[PDB]
Design a protein around this ligand. Structure first.
Ligand SMILES: Nc1ncnc2c1ncn2[C@@H]1O[C@H](COP(=O)(O)OP(=O)(O)O)[C@@H](O)[C@H]1O
Ligand SMILES: [Mg+2]
Length: 296
């Protein structure tokens, strides 16, 4: 299962708040989809359809209501990927990492709720995480040679010398996230940011085990400037997973790292973040056309 949401951020103060060129239709019930058009100027109107479209008023909290169900998969042993795609400036970091509100803090919080509750059935759970950044195919550890190693048999993935932080408490979580320059911003906007949560549960009373990975990914900006190569290769991978045939995971680090959370029963959701601004009509269109191939 692969789902695609689109999110339009509100206009910024230093920009022009004219959003006449984007129009979003109501959620089509009997076809499970939401449409939008973009008026390109010269009256050439381009249609798009996604699984859900979030307008400028929609908040991080509202957005999590429509993601929560996917997160709950990792308790049934599914692997999960949530990607944020779109141009630098469109709100990827804000969507994934906004304090308290973003997909990452919200996900972590949501998972604890379920852990608290499942303890009543004798499930006990270990939660650990890793937080990495990939730039020009170099892995940097944001909790500090880093090599990827897969275990064919157990279908698991390891990155060498990465600090894995054990999430023991809501206090322990809060420290890690509270912890999370001009050059630095340019740098991270050309990088993927991956937050990996591992969920391990055992239930002595039944004997049952469970594992779940959640990969919360904040991608390199999609505008044209290697970053280009890994975005295309992600596109090709996901589309081909949607269509039994051969998938070149190894063609880029990002897809090679995430391969076991993209094959099989794995569930994926992509956020296409778009800017509402006039100057960015073209980059918005590329983002939408990309999101369509990934979805269609
Ligand atoms: N949904 C939103 N609501 C309010 N402000 C937003 C939203 N999305 C983005 N912003 C603001 O717009 C700017 C760009 O967001 P950011 O997340 O840094 O973009 P990106 O990571 O996609 O390059 C930031 O200043 C951010 O606070
Ligand atoms: Mg960013």
């Amino acid at each position: 299962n692969i789902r695609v949401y689109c999110r339009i951020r509100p206009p910024l103060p230093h920009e022009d708040d004219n959003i006449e060129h984007i129009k979003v239709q109501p959620f089509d019930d009997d076809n499970g989809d939401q449409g939008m058009t973009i008026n390109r100027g010269n009256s050439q109107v381009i249609p798009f359809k996604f699984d859900k479209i979030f307008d400028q008023q929609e908040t991080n909290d509202e957005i999590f209501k429509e993601v929560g169900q996917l997160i709950q998969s990792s308790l049934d042993g599914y692997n999960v990927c949530i990607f944020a795609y779109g141009q630098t400036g469109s709100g990827k970091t804000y969507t994934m990492l906004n304090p308290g509100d973003g997909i990452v803090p919200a996900t972590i919080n949501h998972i604890f709720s379920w852990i608290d509750k499942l303890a009543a059935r004798g499930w006990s759970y270990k939660v650990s995480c890793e937080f990495i950044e990939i730039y020009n195919e170099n892995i940097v550890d944001l909790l500090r040679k880093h090599e990827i190693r897969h275990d064919q048999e157990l279908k698991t993935t390891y990155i060498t010398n990465i600090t894995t932080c054990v999430l023991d408490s809501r206090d322990t979580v809060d420290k890690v996230l509270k912890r999370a320059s001009t050059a630095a911003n340019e740098h991270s906007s050309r990088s993927h940011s991956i937050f990996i949560i591992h969920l391990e549960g055992k239930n002595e009373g039944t004997g049952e085990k469970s594992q779940g990975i959640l990969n919360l990914v904040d991608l390199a900006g999609s505008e044209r400037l290697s970053i280009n190569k890994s975005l295309s290769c992600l596109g090709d991978v996901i589309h081909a997973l949607n269509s039994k045939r051969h998938i070149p995971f190894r063609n880029s680090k990002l897809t090679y790292l995430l391969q076991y959370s993209l094959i099989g029963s794995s569930k994926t959701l992509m956020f296409v973040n778009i800017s509402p601004a006039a100057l960015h009509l073209n980059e918005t269109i590329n983002s939408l056309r990309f999101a369509s191939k990934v979805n269609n």
